Amino acid sequence: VKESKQKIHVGPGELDDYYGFWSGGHQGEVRVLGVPSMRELMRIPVFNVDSATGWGLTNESRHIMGDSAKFLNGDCHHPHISMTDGKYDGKYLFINDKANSRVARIRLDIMKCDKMITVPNVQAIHGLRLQKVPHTKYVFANAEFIIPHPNDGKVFDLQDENSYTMYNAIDAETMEMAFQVIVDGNLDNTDADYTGRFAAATCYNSEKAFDLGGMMRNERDWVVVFDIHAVEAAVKAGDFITLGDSKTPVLDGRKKDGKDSKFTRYVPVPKNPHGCNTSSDGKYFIAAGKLSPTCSMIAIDKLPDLFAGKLADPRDVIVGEPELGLGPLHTTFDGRGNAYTTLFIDSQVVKWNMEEAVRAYKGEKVNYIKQKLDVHYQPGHLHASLCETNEADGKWLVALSKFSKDRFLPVGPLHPENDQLIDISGDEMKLVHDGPTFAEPHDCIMARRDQIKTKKIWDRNDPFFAPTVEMAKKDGINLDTDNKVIRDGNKVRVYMTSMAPAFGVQEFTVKQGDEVTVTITNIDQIEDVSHGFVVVNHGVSMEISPQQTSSITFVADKPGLHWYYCSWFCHALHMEMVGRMMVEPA
Amino acid sequence: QKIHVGPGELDDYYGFWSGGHQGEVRVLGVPSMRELMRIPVFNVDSATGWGLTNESRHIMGDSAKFLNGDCHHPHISMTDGKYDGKYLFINDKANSRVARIRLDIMKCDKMITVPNVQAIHGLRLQKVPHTKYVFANAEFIIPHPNDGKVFDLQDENSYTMYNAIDAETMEMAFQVIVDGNLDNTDADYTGRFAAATCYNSEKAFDLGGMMRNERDWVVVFDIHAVEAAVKAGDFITLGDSKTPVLDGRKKDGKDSKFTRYVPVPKNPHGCNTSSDGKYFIAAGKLSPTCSMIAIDKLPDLFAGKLADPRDVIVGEPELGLGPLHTTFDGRGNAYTTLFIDSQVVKWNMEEAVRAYKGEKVNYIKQKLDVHYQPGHLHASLCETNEADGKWLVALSKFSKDRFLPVGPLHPENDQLIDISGDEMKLVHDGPTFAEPHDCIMARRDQIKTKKIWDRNDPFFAPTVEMAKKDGINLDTDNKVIRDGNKVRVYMTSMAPAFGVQEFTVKQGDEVTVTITNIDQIEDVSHGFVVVNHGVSMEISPQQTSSITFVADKPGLHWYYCSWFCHALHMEMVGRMMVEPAWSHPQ
Ligand code: CUZ
Ligand code: CUZ
Ligand code: CUA
Ligand code: CUA
Ligand SMILES: [Ca+2]
Ligand SMILES: [Ca+2]
Ligand SMILES: [Cl-]
Ligand SMILES: [Cl-]
Ligand SMILES: [Cl-]
Ligand SMILES: [K+]
Ligand SMILES: [K+]
Ligand code: NA
Ligand code: NA
Known part of the structure; x- marks a missing residue:
């Protein structure tokens, strides 16, 4: 029994x-x-x-x-x-x-x-x-x-x-x-x-x-x-x-x-x-x-x-x-x-x-x-x-x-x-x-x-x-520290660190039609402090958790000012963790 | 409480x-x-x-x-x-x-x-x-x-x-x-x-x-x-x-x-x-x-x-x-x-x-x-x-x-x-x-x-209006309509069988599949998946649903019901046959 x-x-x-x-x-x-x-x-x-x-x-x-x-x-x-x-x-x-x-x-x-x-x-x-x-x-x-x-x-x-x-x-x-x-x-x-x-x-x-x-x-x-x-x-x-x-x-x-x-x-x-x-x-x-x-x-x-x-x-x-x-x-x-x-x-x-x-x-x-x-x-x-x-x-x-x-x-x-x-x-x-x-x-x-x-x-x-780390290496980029924009014909590779409540690159300018890759390394070391990245009205969205590198590619097909923001509530100043992509007209 | x-x-x-x-x-x-x-x-x-x-x-x-x-x-x-x-x-x-x-x-x-x-x-x-x-x-x-x-x-x-x-x-x-x-x-x-x-x-x-x-x-x-x-x-x-x-x-x-x-x-x-x-x-x-x-x-x-x-x-x-x-x-x-x-x-x-x-x-x-x-x-x-x-x-x-x-x-x-x-x-x-x-x-x-x-x-309702232009009565018809390089398949479904279980198209045809679930029993939903074509949808009781895709691959391609609906659910399947382009004009 x-x-x-x-x-x-x-x-x-x-x-x-x-x-x-x-x-x-x-x-x-x-x-x-x-x-x-x-x-x-x-x-x-x-x-x-x-x-x-x-x-x-x-x-x-x-x-x-x-x-x-x-x-x-x-x-x-x-x-x-x-x-x-x-x-x-x-x-x-x-x-x-x-x-x-x-x-x-x-x-x-x-x-x-x-x-x-x-x-x-x-x-x-x-x-x-x-x-x-x-x-x-x-x-x-x-x-x-x-x-x-x-x-x-x-x-x-x-x-x-x-x-x-x-x-x-x-x-x-x-x-x-x-x-x-x-x-x-x-x-x-x-x-x-x-x-x-x-x-x-x-x-x-x-x-x-x-x-x-x-x-x-x-x-x-x-x-x-x-x-x-x-x-x-x-x-x-x-x-x-x-x-x-x-x-x-x-x-x-x-x-x-x-x-x-x-x-x-x-x-x-x-x-x-x-x-x-x-x-x-x-x-x-x-x-x-x-x-x-x-x-x-x-x-x-x-x-x-x-x-x-x-x-x-x-x-x-x-x-x-x-x-x-x-x-x-x-x-x-x-x-x-x-x-x-x-x-x-x-x-x-x-x-x-x-x-x-x-x-x-x-x-x-x-x-x-x-x-x-x-x-x-x-x-x-x-x-x-x-x-x-x-x-x-x-x-x-x-x-x-x-x-x-x-x-x-x-x-x-x-x-x-x-x-x-x-x-x-x-x-x-x-x-x-x-x-x-x-x-x-x-x-x-x-x-x-x-x-x-x-x-x-x-x-x-x-x-x-690791393939993204390899890409960065070809650009001479140290992902742990760098905040830089690489220009390659009509390709643009943005590399940035992120640390709540701020993106390491908060504005960048490109030409309408450019293919943009944004690579983000989250250098917060506190557990659970994840960041996000959304480009408004471009269909772009991704997670970057602590010590992660993440990257996303999209074409800047709309001239004008286009905001990006952090989607992961990460700090009292979450709402203000934003940046600007500026797209110069064709 | x-x-x-x-x-x-x-x-x-x-x-x-x-x-x-x-x-x-x-x-x-x-x-x-x-x-x-x-x-x-x-x-x-x-x-x-x-x-x-x-x-x-x-x-x-x-x-x-x-x-x-x-x-x-x-x-x-x-x-x-x-x-x-x-x-x-x-x-x-x-x-x-x-x-x-x-x-x-x-x-x-x-x-x-x-x-x-x-x-x-x-x-x-x-x-x-x-x-x-x-x-x-x-x-x-x-x-x-x-x-x-x-x-x-x-x-x-x-x-x-x-x-x-x-x-x-x-x-x-x-x-x-x-x-x-x-x-x-x-x-x-x-x-x-x-x-x-x-x-x-x-x-x-x-x-x-x-x-x-x-x-x-x-x-x-x-x-x-x-x-x-x-x-x-x-x-x-x-x-x-x-x-x-x-x-x-x-x-x-x-x-x-x-x-x-x-x-x-x-x-x-x-x-x-x-x-x-x-x-x-x-x-x-x-x-x-x-x-x-x-x-x-x-x-x-x-x-x-x-x-x-x-x-x-x-x-x-x-x-x-x-x-x-x-x-x-x-x-x-x-x-x-x-x-x-x-x-x-x-x-x-x-x-x-x-x-x-x-x-x-x-x-x-x-x-x-x-x-x-x-x-x-x-x-x-x-x-x-x-x-x-x-x-x-x-x-x-x-x-x-x-x-x-x-x-x-x-x-x-x-x-x-x-x-x-x-x-x-x-x-x-x-x-x-x-x-x-x-x-x-x-x-x-x-x-x-x-x-x-x-x-x-x-x-x-837009799908019903589409069907009407084709003479279809969605509640009963199991028909394949041909229109140039478009194929519009209309079928009823009732567990465990699709109303149209096979159809044949030309490679490159744009295929729309419209399915009306005519089961009346609550919770008996059906699905529709075409293998290896990225096609998936729900059809719940008395719903009509439709999906459009290109038949880009010659040969036989299976489709199946994704919603477990019956003891014979593994067997609720059908076949799309795609004739090769080298046997058709151009
Ligand atoms: Cu968008 S904010 Cu306090 Cu509602 Cu979460
Ligand atoms: Cu695919 S079957 Cu009994 Cu496992 Cu559900
Ligand atoms: Cu970074 Cu919220
Ligand atoms: Cu229909 Cu399982
Ligand atoms: Ca203020
Ligand atoms: Ca058997
Ligand atoms: Cl026991
Ligand atoms: Cl509120
Ligand atoms: Cl098993
Ligand atoms: K969280
Ligand atoms: K179910
Ligand atoms: Na693989
Ligand atoms: Na609308």
Whole structure:
């Protein structure tokens, strides 16, 4: 007998116990919450354009985004923290972009997106998870949609032999592509084991159809399992192809005339399975059945035998398939032997014992279902604290539901999502908080307070703005001290320091049509004294936090006097922290 | 007073938070302080497609080219000095705009760029007999014309103007040229008078210059006199704008018919009408005081019956360091933020008024420490004669240690204070992104929202007229219209299927996709994303939405529904097929 009775109120002056990193869904950002208060502490722009910080407007951010800076949107579902020996190391957060086919990396010491990649020769990055062991060497990412190769407009048929999608591995540290694996069917969600050898992904479109009925035709789709050791061996030996103008090694993981690839095995699983979740004891890949009212449990310790050809049937790695309820979508773990699964249709979270499900599969009469909790309403992902690590602590559970209906004040035709906090510390789940959120977070991830270490002020050598420091070097500029205007034909480069309540350059004059770059170094050393920079009626806006250098480029297309001001309230004389751009007529 | 809203309980008040330089409006429930909705206004919203869709860009006009805004001052329309819940208005200081939000659909439905001005900062609404005018301050002095010949702020044609917008039409009504500049503004409870603070009476551009005078002033506007001069045709126009412009400057020491200038120390900031209608209260900022202007003495001031503009001042209580803003409990007490001392001071207005007559009396009742450096503050219904004295939000600019570390950029701290009793009680610390400046609360029963769209809503009526030219009936048609190098796709949607699931175009075609969500069930919203084309929008039940993009890439391109709407949501998808340009003319 142990009861669920954790404190939920975080009063003035008290601090949260966990960080929560919420995906922003089709709003495109990442949100940092405090747990258990469920208050949003910070927003990290990633695929959105952020008016406040200038992400998407500044030269530093557009350099990280590359050519994809032309997009103003993203759709990000699956945030994950890098690991060392199967435990969070607090270094990086990665997330997908389903809308423009990207993966982004966030540095958790500065809480900024510091790298972004457009995955080549695919459409729509959905599923994303990280290698756990020995550490996060690879980010694994699913491309969801089957497309022609090449996609040059000659062939549109998804049944053609060169229409397919690929599993993607990105080098976590360099954020360059490592390899791609062609698969049969498509790819939904993915997870990795606790050794580094295996990863797995659900497939819902084994039919390679484009219509709803066609995509639901097969009694079973599959989870495809990847022998990452085998893939690495083939890349190391150089036997791969490349596609288009991308140098990424491409390996063929499709079945050929019934014959298995070295790189993959296809484990039949009902039906349009969705979630793909590694148990924290590392025993199971658990696929949520969605259209089937089940989960399927793949025994990871049978996968070597499967790939060695020792097993008569790929279904032999299935060791449990418990019946849970209508519309299972995702599963998480308390570290105590229980799994917790969302039932989208029944609108519940079901708590069940994994080892008892395995014994039921053998035909033992044993009830593995422990409890069903109503949630509100239609849950998608759920996440228990540290569930993606061998330190899963069984304390907090968030169920992220898609219809809030009557749970909050009405706010028009568009409704918030309902992310509900559930106490799982004891024998019974207890619903303790309804958290409304914008734009459909899909998944979230929690970390202990002590697993995240952040900078209080920027380092002057930070790679985030090192290209800008390089530009300054070519102009002979010492960013820490200089207040100067460089003139270069019709280009103008303003460099200034800033120190509340004054910009270091408070007026400058240019010619109508000049392309103006303004670089600002915040030389305040007091924590929290951020500055801003807005040029009135020019669409220019950006953050400069303590010891940061930030820069932005715009064309002075309007003759006359044009004011600029500090947007970050920074001092009693904030309103007076202004300057003038004077534009001489053409 | 209930502080906590548990699962299944609803908040008692709506809160409408400004987003500051993040550019949106945020809808909170009070007292839980949870964010229920985001309403994009000057920001580009990836989730709903605000700034990408044709409906939103139509409302933004040419200013749709800007991806940023800086909004500070949200206010709710009134009838006879009470909220009527029809509209919310807000400023854009970055690109000189005013936006209107329709509170039944919680969307921005109108936007205006204020002509011949730079930086719309202060904004407030006429109270009586209703909100006929939106009053808005242009903060920065500029030359007229601003054509690059003259830059001097001391030129006789360099000035700023006070701005009145017709609330219902969202067209300019008039502009009043003023001496000095403009900061914040409020209106009386008769409709005759508005008032604004000025901090740059010096017409300087440097910090020392702007602080030189011991007093600036609050300028008072006789709206009756302005309206009468407009009716009589007694006005000019500036540049290409037909807005009536009136001259409220002093000339050679003689007052305008339209304005009186009340000397007030010192770089004063907040300008707040007491809920009993007695006072304009200006916060002294650099002077440790507030100055109370007796509204019932203004008739005598404009009739030349007073010896000295100071004679309308009837109190100037000393409150503490850095008074910024004042609000009201409706019980005769005022509450003022002290930015420097980092407190809210509660004081009794009538006792301050007799202390100004020399009657020694302690008008200060309590000082509450806030965390840290408060800017605006807001008591529930403070802007109406229904000011109820229950809740107070102080919106602070430095959160320092009050929340978990999240890197060099910190959240703001908006603190909920119980003022229902004699003693202010700090109950909740609410972290927020991007610097909310002001917020406004409304009782739950003052806001009436629509659960699904009306098919004749003006928000998308232009789109309906477009469809009519094509013979479309949006409620039923699934058609692809071709028109040269334009393609107009019209479809219905109903979970989990798009009404048009594939279409074919030529490379280079300009494609418009119009979607009408014909689901009738509340909260069943759909989305639309074209992979790798930067296209994303919301379509909520009974809404029509449209978006335009170029099919610049040959081949098959998937589109999908971004709003989780159904168990088969992963499968609500379609295909755009783009025929290569080398197979088509040119
Ligand atoms: Cu993209 S899917 Cu269950 Cu993760 Cu939401
Ligand atoms: Cu724009 S100022 Cu006190 Cu309102 Cu923040
Ligand atoms: Cu710098 Cu406010
Ligand atoms: Cu329509 Cu999900
Ligand atoms: Ca299938
Ligand atoms: Ca002054
Ligand atoms: Cl998953
Ligand atoms: Cl238990
Ligand atoms: Cl104010
Ligand atoms: K939703
Ligand atoms: K701040
Ligand atoms: Na990159
Ligand atoms: Na307009």
